[PDB]
């Protein structure tokens, strides 16, 4: 069955207005994918150290020591918003929906093709690419997930994100276990710290293989092969934001006197002595009833160590902030509260004509304001008693540890059973959409890499590969390296994402931030003489919501 | 019944999805609306007659006489966009819908006031408002649309754009018929023009009376009035325009050459001498196949004389125009293709805290590019025979009537069987929304004041009169002016108006024109520190469509 | 710490973690708040400082209340001014139902 | 309709014990509230800043600067425990339930 | 919630009571540097102003549909139905040292 | 059983700082506090709420 | 995902390892630091912790 086309191009995305405002998002995505041999057909376990780094006294950070398993396999990874929505849909379901459901996900292939390439040893010499008819292209499908979950998004690595290109999937590999010793150290340390890779904890040995715990497909031209579809069970993700902080919850202090003409300058005023206010407060001393002393319900977010690294088995790792806004507009605190900065290029985003290998990237900053400003952070003695002498307050400024660049904020972490905190908001197109939980007792209550997380199920992972196009001569018993004939492959990749989106409702009388296209964005959104295209992020909470 | 209310406040704009992608807009508005007894309680037929202007040569266009009847009868005018939707309802409106459907208009008026202004004469002195609970308010619902048709938009007299702020209605008034001679001239022009108004035909006499016409209801506190629904029947709006123009229609020509490296300086080319290329044209002559020669289905657009005045029985006119864009964006003839100017004021758009009375505006300036740019036009000589000879050519340059200002651009007019034309696009928020067909055999293909033209059958219009509340003197047989008791009225008036929408689908991979909120407009949808307020206008059919 | 006298670690401490048993705030007669909305983020707190109730799901809408304009027999919405109107004042009585 | 009353006044709270052990608390409380025209009748969006008293070198804590949009409107709220019971009820309450 | 500001309904049945001016938070972006009583140079106290991604204009009028009473007309809310965990009345002592 | 938290803690973000809150009980003698560490609240009212 | 060997191993050793191949700031991906453009294994984003 060699003329007979196996499947449909379809890139569209579909919306399917219901009763009651709510919206059925399909998004059809159709790829080409290219996939070459393997380089060698044996899973390899290979250990990466990179000592010559942190053997430099104050460099541990960029310690990148680790063991994976080098299978012959390739993934074929589509979770990432950019496979998905173009800069127009996503500014639709952005500017109109108030929440998003993951629903369903199915992935097919065909019209695959497999050609053997015949070096026409002669004159430049030449090339003759051929197609092998009978040969097959390997398809395993990981439903129980019994394989390690690997997110190619978190390398930029999933397809591309243009219809009309090509792409390719990634080769798989997977963390091996390995004990791990470094110790921190700064440029005036004496001696030479402790940087040693111990090896493996046979206790923790867990070598997979596709081929014994995956049922393999053979597909030939005439062949085809299509997932099933599987159904989600995520909460779900809201496309708004909150702005309001525990300074602006509840009722405000009435206004005893209220400015009686125009100008930013004519304020107005509360009319009672701080000393003289009914209220209530958590300050059992003073009698003081202050806008930042005043009593309220719980606490919108939290104060975590920045720039913090702890260490375990494995070796150092910095520690994860899950936190939104908090501070002025060209005012962050980038490590505080944790905005992701990512980096990528030419397939998913990055003008594609661009030169050179140096990735392209940006830092996303969510519009919730559910962050921190260390700055603005002090500490007072039980005392209280103002204004507070130094002796008294501890503040961002004086030193912990005799360290001058180092001060409590630092160190700080206010999460407590009165935190009140929001999930990672989507990211596109560079953001993971979906992600499989921690299979441990207690599971964390975010994750900081994609807004859904499939708890109880996730789809599993589709791995790809040429099968062995052997030549005439193959001695099993001959380690040499198996000769075999050049063979490379080419199919089709079709995968259908459903959603489920709620229209929202204005409520107040002003108007709302809105994504929208300006003479200055204009030209991010189209391609250009030379046919280059580029895909600039966008933000996706912008519109408000009431917290309390 | 004076202790129970009649009625409910409702503003809301409903927006109900339906299957296909179709929405019904409910557009729900109240108003508190303040009336006035009248000045006087007769018809008055009064005369207008500013000859002290026009009496300066050169001044024809500011002539302002006219004959109207004067009615002790106030009209009740909702035919406004601004009315209906707020900057949010709108921002929503125009950018996903794709066409505009107007179905059914209703109102109703309700908790009735009527007080009594008594004037205690004492000291400063005071002034005692009282309900007068037995009195009664006039009104009379023109359901066959006896009256003549006066679309209170036109004056910026319709209700006013706030929920939160009371507004009133506008005494109305109607054109009676007048002959009137006016003469053109310029500043040097010689001798006494001809300037004078010959009074009324009797064969074009119509005194118009609403109590001989239209059944009146009195509605004291414990009653209310409800209009019926009336049903629309006018064509769909569209919310998209039109770019193309003749030069972009159908096939471009093939390009032998294609640039081989990037810049903006890196042109195609034909590659074909203009003289040896096939195709069609129009010009039986030449052999020069040419962008600007080849044959193009027919013409969108048209050219008419501009700043043209016409004149009958009335006295002279400005000749209207029906165009769109047409040249350059800072480079218009706003009098060319007629770009619209609004002007109003406070209750309307304008800035509330504003002082004196210099009315706001602006002239709308369409997205469809379907206006003419008259420098660009020119005509040759039947032998074409290029570089065209000064004697073959007539150019908006040369004069006319040995004018120096005028040239054949301004006489010119090419209008014909062949023009393909778009219908006015709806402004926002001065607007009017519908008008009421011309009584004529031939009607015009398009009204340049609304979008929509209900034809067969419009809304009837609401009259509204506090009725006469006599003191003891009162005598027919005596001139005088009936002294009566000042009283005046407050009522609520509640209007439903429902349209239907197509949402729209995208068919380019290029995002698209989309309404939205900047760091610039940001205040234009706010209130202030004082509580001031304005309502700046937007555009409507920004999203392009494909002509052809 | 930090050559500060007036600080110390305890100061800077924080020992929640994955063994922390914990209880949610007591009732406060007769000042304090009896329920409370959740908040709409992702991941919710384990509880409420201000409440000891929080609905989740859903809670009672709140009652706005206001009089109406009661307005003079002169007013003109084209002048800024601010619309002179009658001096009203309203009492009504409130009426509520807690059930527990 | 004036002359005519539209509600009755409540202020009792019954407590209603059912079968093992629980019991269902019904608090009623009714109030008389006094309503002022609003001094605007406009949305007003202000700012509050005290930069005088944060200009102070070591006094962060002691900051208010917010914006708030001022409403026309007024709210009644009745989510406090003083609203509906007594030293009286509360002592029931809370020497002999074990859960609420 | 209004308690949060000593703001809710009054206490006394026998005392008539009223309601609060509504307001709500406007976004804002502001700076304010730690200082002490020694620190040298002017931190920095800056208020920035709003985010336009963070605007939120609330009107009642536009989001909630308004019931106008006269003194013949009443008005009564739903019975709303909480979803809320049950709120223990007893206290725990034991600490670690206590345990087992 | 409970958990320690820095006290008199203040934390920034977009808006401005903000005291870090505590949610917890007892933990010392009586007449024997730490108000701050595990933030015992402050009622502060007048004349119509007590 | 690992980042992608460009350079790998030749002959068997602990001593032949296989190289990223490309200049730590001129690498695609994400990262959670908007300053600096360095991805490193160390550097670049992590679903959580
Ligand atoms: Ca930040
Ligand atoms: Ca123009
Ligand atoms: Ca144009
Ligand atoms: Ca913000
Ligand atoms: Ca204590």
Same mark, same amino acid.
């Not at 997930?145 to 290109?165: C, I």
């Not at 972490?413 to 905190?421: E, F, Q």
């Given at each position: 069955?060699?003329?007979?086309?196996?499947?449909?191009?379809?890139?569209?995305?579909?919306?399917?207005?219901?009763?009651?405002?709510?919206?059925?998002?399909?998004?059809?995505?159709?790829?080409? +994918?290219?996939?070459?041999?393997? &380089? /060698?057909?044996?899973?390899?376990?290979?250990? %990466?150290? !990179?000592? #010559?780094? @942190? *053997?430099?006294?104050?460099?541990?950070?960029?310690?990148?020591?680790?063991?994976?398993?080098?299978?012959?396999?390739?993934?074929?990874?589509?979770?990432?918003?950019?496979?998905?929505?173009?800069?127009?849909?996503?500014?639709?379901?952005?500017?109109?929906?108030?929440?998003?459901?993951?629903?369903?996900?199915?992935?097919?292939?065909?019209?695959? +093709?497999?050609?053997?390439?015949? &070096? /026409?040893?002669?004159?430049?010499?030449?090339? %003759?690419? !051929?197609? #092998?008819? @009978? *040969?097959?292209?390997?398809?395993?499908?990981?439903?129980?997930?019994?394989?390690?979950?690997?997110?190619?998004?978190?390398?930029?690595?999933?397809?591309?994100?243009?219809?009309?290109?090509?792409?390719?999937?990634?080769?798989?590999?997977?963390?091996?276990?390995?004990?791990?010793?470094?110790?921190?150290?700064?440029?005036?340390?004496?001696?030479?710290?402790?940087?040693?890779?111990?090896?493996?904890?046979?206790?923790?040995?867990?070598?997979?293989?596709?081929?014994?715990?995956?049922?393999?497909?053979?597909?030939?031209?005439?062949?085809?092969?299509?997932?099933?579809?599987?159904?989600?069970?995520?909460?779900?993700?809201?496309?708004?934001?909150?702005?309001?902080?525990?300074?602006?919850?509840?009722?405000?202090?009435?206004?005893?006197?209220?400015?009686?003409?125009?100008?930013?300058?004519?304020?107005?005023?509360?009319?009672?002595?701080?000393?003289?206010?009914?209220?209530?407060?958590?300050?059992?001393?003073?009698?003081?009833?202050?806008?930042?002393?005043?009593?309220?319900?719980?606490?919108?977010?939290?104060?975590?160590?920045?720039?913090?690294?702890?260490?375990?088995?494995?070796?150092?790792?910095?520690?994860?902030?899950?936190?939104?806004?908090?501070?002025?507009?060209?005012?962050?605190?980038?490590?505080?509260?944790?905005?992701?900065?990512?980096?990528?290029?030419?397939?998913?985003?990055?003008?594609?004509?661009?030169?050179?290998?140096?990735?392209?990237?940006?830092?996303?900053?969510?519009?919730?304001?559910?962050?921190?400003?260390?700055?603005?952070?002090?500490?007072?003695?039980?005392?209280?008693?103002?204004?507070?002498?130094?002796?008294?307050?501890?503040?961002?400024?004086?030193?912990?540890?005799?360290?001058?660049?180092?001060?409590?904020?630092?160190?700080?972490?206010?999460?407590?059973?009165?935190?009140?905190?929001?999930?990672?908001?989507?990211?596109?197109?560079?953001?993971?959409?979906?992600?499989?939980?921690?299979?441990?007792?207690?599971?964390?209550?975010?994750?900081?890499?994609?807004?859904?997380?499939?708890?109880?199920?996730?789809?599993?992972?589709?791995?790809?590969?040429?099968?062995?196009?052997?030549?005439?001569?193959?001695?099993?018993?001959?380690?040499?390296?198996?000769?075999?004939?050049?063979?490379?492959?080419?199919?089709?990749?079709?995968?259908?994402?459903?959603?489920?989106?709620?229209?929202?409702?204005?409520?107040?009388?002003?108007?709302?931030?809105?994504?929208?296209?300006?003479?200055?964005?204009?030209?991010?959104?189209?391609?250009?003489?030379?046919?280059?295209?580029?895909?600039?992020?966008?933000?996706?909470?912008?519109?408000?919501?009431?917290?309390?």
């Amino acid at each position: 069955g060699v003329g007979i086309s196996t499947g449909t191009f379809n890139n569209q995305t579909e919306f399917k207005f219901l009763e009651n405002g709510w919206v059925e998002i399909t998004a059809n995505s159709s790829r080409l +994918v290219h996939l070459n041999m393997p &380089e /060698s057909e044996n899973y390899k376990r290979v250990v %990466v150290n !990179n000592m #010559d780094k @942190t *053997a430099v006294k104050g460099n541990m950070a960029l310690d990148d020591i680790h063991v994976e398993i080098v299978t012959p396999w390739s993934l074929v990874d589509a979770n990432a918003w950019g496979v998905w929505f173009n800069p127009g849909d996503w500014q639709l379901i952005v500017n109109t929906m108030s929440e998003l459901h993951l629903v369903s996900f199915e992935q097919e292939i065909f019209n695959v +093709v497999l050609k053997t390439v015949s &070096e /026409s040893a002669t004159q430049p010499p030449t090339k %003759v690419y !051929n197609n #092998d008819l @009978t *040969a097959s292209l390997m398809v395993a499908l990981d439903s129980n997930n019994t394989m390690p979950f690997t997110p190619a998004a978190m390398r930029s690595e999933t397809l591309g994100f243009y219809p009309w290109k090509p792409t390719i999937p990634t080769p798989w590999r997977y963390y091996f276990q390995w004990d791990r010793t470094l110790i921190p150290s700064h440029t005036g340390t004496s001696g030479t710290p402790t940087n040693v890779y111990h090896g493996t904890d046979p206790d923790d040995v867990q070598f997979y293989t596709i081929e014994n715990s995956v049922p393999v497909h053979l597909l030939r031209t005439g062949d085809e092969f299509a997932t099933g579809t599987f159904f989600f069970d995520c909460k779900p993700c809201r496309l708004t934001h909150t702005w309001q902080t525990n300074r602006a919850l509840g009722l405000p202090p009435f206004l005893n006197s209220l400015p009686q003409s125009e100008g930013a300058t004519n304020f107005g005023d509360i009319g009672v002595q701080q000393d003289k206010r009914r209220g209530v407060t958590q300050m059992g001393n003073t009698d003081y009833i202050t806008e930042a002393t005043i009593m309220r319900p719980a606490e919108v977010g939290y104060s975590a160590p920045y720039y913090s690294f702890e260490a375990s088995t494995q070796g150092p790792f910095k520690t994860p902030i899950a936190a939104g806004r908090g501070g002025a507009q060209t005012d962050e605190n980038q490590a505080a509260d944790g905005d992701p900065r990512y980096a990528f290029g030419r397939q998913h985003g990055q003008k594609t004509t661009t030169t050179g290998e140096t990735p392209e990237r940006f830092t996303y900053i969510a519009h919730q304001d559910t962050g921190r400003y260390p700055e603005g952070d002090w500490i007072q003695n039980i005392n209280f008693n103002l204004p507070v002498t130094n002796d008294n307050v501890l503040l961002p400024t004086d030193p912990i540890g005799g360290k001058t660049g180092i001060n409590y904020t630092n160190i700080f972490n206010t999460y407590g059973p009165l935190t009140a905190l929001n999930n990672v908001p989507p990211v596109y197109p560079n953001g993971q959409i979906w992600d499989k939980e921690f299979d441990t007792d207690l599971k964390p209550r975010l994750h900081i890499n994609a807004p859904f997380v499939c708890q109880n199920n996730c789809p599993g992972q589709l791995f790809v590969k040429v099968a062995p196009n052997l030549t005439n001569q193959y001695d099993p018993d001959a380690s040499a390296n198996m000769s075999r004939i050049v063979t490379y492959s080419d199919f089709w990749w079709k995968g259908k994402l459903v959603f489920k989106a709620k229209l929202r409702a204005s409520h107040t009388w002003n108007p709302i931030q809105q994504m929208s296209i300006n003479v200055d964005n204009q030209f991010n959104y189209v391609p250009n003489n030379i046919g280059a295209m580029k895909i600039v992020y966008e933000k996706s909470q912008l519109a408000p919501r009431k917290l309390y």
